[PDB]
Ligand SMILES: [Ca+2]
């Protein structure tokens with residue numbers, strides 16, 4: 126199929142579909158979805174497609190975000206038990222729940238997280254309250 | 268790490284759930300086998316060769332029961 130049924134380099138992918146790697150050409154919508162389709166995965170980049178996204182029904186968009194994080198999540202994750210968006214806007218919404226105890230670290234915005242998620246490499250609470258004021262001990266030898 | 272945008276999202280969020288490793292590993296094996304199923308769905312969808320759309324229901328219900336089965 127790939128080793129010898131065709132000329133390797135005699136001619137390109139046909140103009141019916143769009144080139145994206147020398148080993149792969151891509152049909153249409155697939156260049157914009159975030160899937161590893163082009164086989165170097167560079168579909169949603171360069172300059173051709175998807176600087177932005179938009180959400181359908183039963184989905185919500187993390188507006189305050191950049192391409193490195195996320196820009197659309199389903200309702201299956203809004204006001205759930207775990208933050209999803211870049212700034213964790215999904216858990217605030219109109220919910221704004223009360224209950225939080227000494228068993229979890231308390232953020233400025235009101236949300237709470239486990240104590241282990243304080244002073245680390247991750248933006249856990251969205252507000253970055255879990256990171257502000259921390260004093261990181263130095264790294265290991267390795 | 269995984270091909271479809273949604274499977275990577277499920278994989279980070281499954282790690283955010285701190286699920287047991289044996290349950291978490293079984294998630295990928297069900298999603299990675301679905302990865303090969305969704306590729307042939309997506310080929311026959313954009314090419315329109317799936318005239319009856321048989322490959323969509325069997326991936327949608329599988330994903331739904333995956334979400335219910337593994338505690339998501
Ligand atoms: Ca893609």
Ligand SMILES: [Ca+2]
Nearest residue numbers: 202207209215
């Ligand atoms: Ca959430």
Ligand SMILES: [Ca+2]
Nearest residue numbers: 242247249255
């Ligand atoms: Ca943190």
